[PDB]
RNA sequence: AGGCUCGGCUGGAGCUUCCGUCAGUGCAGAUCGUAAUGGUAGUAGCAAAUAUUCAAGUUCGAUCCUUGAAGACUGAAGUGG
Protein backbone atom coordinates (compact mmCIF):
# COMPACT_ATOMS: atom_id res chain seq x y z
CA UNK A 1 0.00 0.00 0.00
CA UNK A 2 2.94 2.30 0.75
CA UNK A 3 5.30 1.12 -2.01
CA UNK A 4 3.39 1.92 -5.21
CA UNK A 5 3.91 3.07 -8.80
CA UNK A 6 1.54 5.10 -10.96
CA UNK A 7 1.68 6.55 -14.46
CA UNK A 8 0.43 10.14 -14.72
CA UNK A 9 0.14 12.76 -17.44
CA UNK A 10 1.17 16.28 -16.40
CA UNK A 11 -0.08 19.31 -18.35
CA UNK A 12 3.13 21.32 -18.13
CA UNK A 13 1.64 23.83 -20.57
CA UNK A 14 -1.10 24.72 -18.10
CA UNK A 15 1.24 24.49 -15.11
CA UNK A 16 3.87 26.97 -16.34
CA UNK A 17 1.52 29.39 -18.12
CA UNK A 18 2.74 32.98 -18.02
CA UNK A 19 6.28 32.27 -16.78
CA UNK A 20 9.23 34.23 -18.10
CA UNK A 21 11.34 32.83 -20.90
CA UNK A 22 14.47 32.13 -18.83
CA UNK A 23 12.56 30.28 -16.09
CA UNK A 24 10.14 27.95 -17.91
CA UNK A 25 12.19 24.75 -17.64
CA UNK A 26 13.20 25.16 -13.96
CA UNK A 27 9.60 26.07 -13.19
CA UNK A 28 8.40 22.97 -15.05
CA UNK A 29 10.72 20.87 -12.89
CA UNK A 30 9.32 22.58 -9.79
CA UNK A 31 5.75 21.95 -10.98
CA UNK A 32 6.54 18.28 -11.57
CA UNK A 33 7.86 18.08 -8.01
CA UNK A 34 4.69 19.79 -6.75
CA UNK A 35 2.48 17.38 -8.70
CA UNK A 36 4.34 14.38 -7.31
CA UNK A 37 4.10 15.82 -3.79
CA UNK A 38 0.34 16.31 -4.08
CA UNK A 39 -0.49 12.97 -5.71
CA UNK A 40 1.91 10.65 -3.86
CA UNK A 41 1.77 12.60 -0.56
CA UNK A 42 5.54 12.64 -0.08
CA UNK A 43 7.58 15.72 0.79
CA UNK A 44 10.74 14.09 -0.59
CA UNK A 45 10.57 14.04 -4.40
CA UNK A 46 13.46 13.22 -6.74
CA UNK A 47 13.46 13.81 -10.50
CA UNK A 48 15.30 11.33 -12.69
CA UNK A 49 18.08 12.75 -14.84
CA UNK A 50 16.27 11.42 -17.91
CA UNK A 51 13.12 13.32 -16.94
CA UNK A 52 15.25 16.44 -16.52
CA UNK A 53 16.75 15.74 -19.94
CA UNK A 54 13.31 15.49 -21.52
CA UNK A 55 12.05 18.66 -19.84
CA UNK A 56 15.13 20.52 -21.11
CA UNK A 57 15.06 18.74 -24.48
CA UNK A 58 13.72 21.79 -26.36
CA UNK A 59 15.67 24.49 -24.56
CA UNK A 60 14.79 26.66 -21.60
CA UNK A 61 11.67 28.41 -22.96
CA UNK A 62 9.93 25.92 -25.29
CA UNK A 63 9.15 23.30 -22.65
CA UNK A 64 7.04 20.32 -23.80
CA UNK A 65 3.32 20.87 -23.38
CA UNK A 66 2.61 17.49 -21.74
CA UNK A 67 4.79 14.90 -20.03
CA UNK A 68 4.03 11.27 -19.13
CA UNK A 69 5.77 10.33 -15.87
CA UNK A 70 5.92 7.30 -13.59
CA UNK A 71 5.79 8.32 -9.93
CA UNK A 72 7.08 5.46 -7.77
CA UNK A 73 6.64 5.96 -4.04
CA UNK A 74 9.20 3.73 -2.34
CA UNK A 75 10.89 3.20 1.01
CA UNK A 76 13.77 5.46 2.02
CA UNK A 77 16.69 3.04 2.23
CA UNK A 78 18.52 5.61 4.37
CA UNK A 79 17.09 4.93 7.83
CA UNK A 80 18.22 8.18 9.50
CA UNK A 81 16.18 10.26 7.04
CA UNK A 82 13.42 12.41 8.52
CA UNK A 83 10.73 10.67 6.45
CA UNK A 84 10.40 6.98 5.59
CA UNK A 85 9.09 7.47 2.03
CA UNK A 86 10.17 9.38 -1.05
CA UNK A 87 8.89 9.60 -4.62
CA UNK A 88 10.97 9.08 -7.76
CA UNK A 89 9.78 10.56 -11.06
CA UNK A 90 10.88 8.90 -14.30
CA UNK A 91 10.28 9.74 -17.95
CA UNK A 92 7.84 7.61 -19.95
CA UNK A 93 8.25 8.21 -23.71
CA UNK A 94 4.88 8.94 -25.26
CA UNK A 95 3.87 10.12 -28.74
CA UNK A 96 0.07 10.28 -28.34
CA UNK A 97 -1.40 11.67 -25.12
CA UNK A 98 -5.03 11.36 -26.22
CA UNK A 99 -7.10 8.93 -24.17
CA UNK A 100 -4.45 8.25 -21.52
CA UNK A 101 -5.48 8.38 -17.86
CA UNK A 102 -3.93 7.82 -14.45
CA UNK A 103 -2.78 4.20 -14.34
CA UNK A 104 -1.60 1.82 -11.63
CA UNK A 105 1.59 -0.06 -12.43
C1' A B 1 22.52 81.53 45.03
C1' G B 2 27.21 80.09 43.56
C1' G B 3 27.63 75.27 46.28
C1' C B 4 28.14 72.32 50.82
C1' U B 5 27.47 68.34 54.86
C1' C B 6 25.83 63.61 56.07
C1' G B 7 23.54 58.65 54.82
C1' G B 8 23.50 54.03 51.41
C1' C B 9 26.16 51.33 47.30
C1' U B 10 30.75 50.80 44.12
C1' G B 11 36.19 51.60 44.60
C1' G B 12 41.05 50.34 46.32
C1' A B 13 45.47 54.80 48.16
C1' G B 14 45.47 58.83 48.99
C1' C B 15 43.12 63.07 50.85
C1' U B 16 42.19 67.56 54.10
C1' U B 17 40.98 72.36 57.93
C1' C B 18 42.57 77.33 58.43
C1' C B 19 46.39 81.65 57.39
C1' G B 20 49.20 84.19 53.44
C1' U B 21 50.41 84.13 48.35
C1' C B 22 50.32 82.61 43.33
C1' A B 23 47.43 80.92 38.82
C1' G B 24 47.52 77.13 32.22
C1' U B 25 41.18 78.73 37.95
C1' G B 26 34.67 77.79 36.45
C1' C B 27 31.51 76.73 29.37
C1' A B 28 25.68 75.74 26.16
C1' G B 29 26.91 77.84 22.06
C1' A B 30 32.42 79.91 18.52
C1' U B 31 29.22 75.93 10.54
C1' C B 32 34.52 75.46 18.03
C1' G B 33 38.87 70.77 18.59
C1' U B 34 38.75 65.68 19.70
C1' A B 35 36.29 60.75 21.03
C1' A B 36 31.93 58.28 21.25
C1' U B 37 26.46 57.71 20.27
C1' G B 38 21.24 58.42 18.40
C1' G B 39 16.20 59.19 15.17
C1' U B 40 16.30 58.36 10.12
C1' A B 41 16.27 52.40 9.88
C1' G B 42 16.22 46.78 9.45
C1' U B 43 14.86 51.98 5.75
C1' A B 44 17.55 53.63 0.52
C1' G B 45 19.28 49.75 -1.39
C1' C B 46 22.52 44.81 -2.99
C1' A B 47 18.35 45.44 -10.85
C1' A B 48 24.18 46.68 -17.11
C1' A B 49 27.35 42.29 -19.40
C1' U B 50 20.96 36.22 -22.26
C1' A B 51 21.00 30.96 -17.68
C1' U B 52 20.65 27.81 -15.45
C1' U B 53 18.47 22.50 -14.19
C1' C B 54 18.83 17.19 -12.48
C1' A B 55 21.43 13.25 -9.67
C1' A B 56 25.43 12.25 -6.64
C1' G B 57 30.09 13.32 -3.45
C1' U B 58 32.20 15.74 0.90
C1' U B 59 30.45 18.20 5.29
C1' C B 60 27.50 19.54 11.60
C1' G B 61 25.91 22.39 7.61
C1' A B 62 25.84 23.24 0.20
C1' U B 63 21.90 27.81 -5.30
C1' C B 64 27.32 29.19 -4.73
C1' C B 65 32.91 23.67 -3.46
C1' U B 66 33.68 18.80 -6.62
C1' U B 67 31.98 14.76 -10.25
C1' G B 68 28.55 13.19 -14.21
C1' A B 69 24.22 14.41 -17.52
C1' A B 70 21.58 18.30 -19.93
C1' G B 71 20.69 23.54 -21.58
C1' A B 72 23.05 28.19 -23.01
C1' C B 73 26.89 31.95 -23.80
C1' U B 74 32.18 34.32 -25.63
C1' G B 75 32.40 32.97 -31.07
C1' A B 76 39.39 33.24 -33.50
C1' A B 77 39.70 42.22 -34.30
C1' G B 78 37.29 35.70 -28.08
C1' U B 79 35.05 35.50 -21.87
C1' G B 80 41.09 31.26 -25.97
C1' G B 81 46.81 30.69 -25.78
UniProtKB/Swiss-Prot annotation:
Domain of life of the organism encoding this protein: Eukaryota
GO MF annotations for this entry? structural constituent of ribosome
Q: Which keywords are on file for this protein?
A: Ribonucleoprotein, Ribosomal protein
One BP term from GO: cytoplasmic translation
**Which Gene Ontology terms of cellular component type are present?**
cytosolic large ribosomal subunit
Q: Could you confirm whether the keyword rRNA-binding appears in this record? A: no
Give the family this protein belongs to, as stated in its UniProt record: Belongs to the eukaryotic ribosomal protein eL31 family.
The molecule here is called Large ribosomal subunit protein eL31
Task: Identify the species of origin.
Answer: Caenorhabditis elegans
Q: Which gene encodes it?
A: rpl-31
Amino acid sequence: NEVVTREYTIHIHARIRGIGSKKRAPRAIDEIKKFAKIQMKTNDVRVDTKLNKFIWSKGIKNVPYRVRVRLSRRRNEDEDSAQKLYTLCTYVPCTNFHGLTNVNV
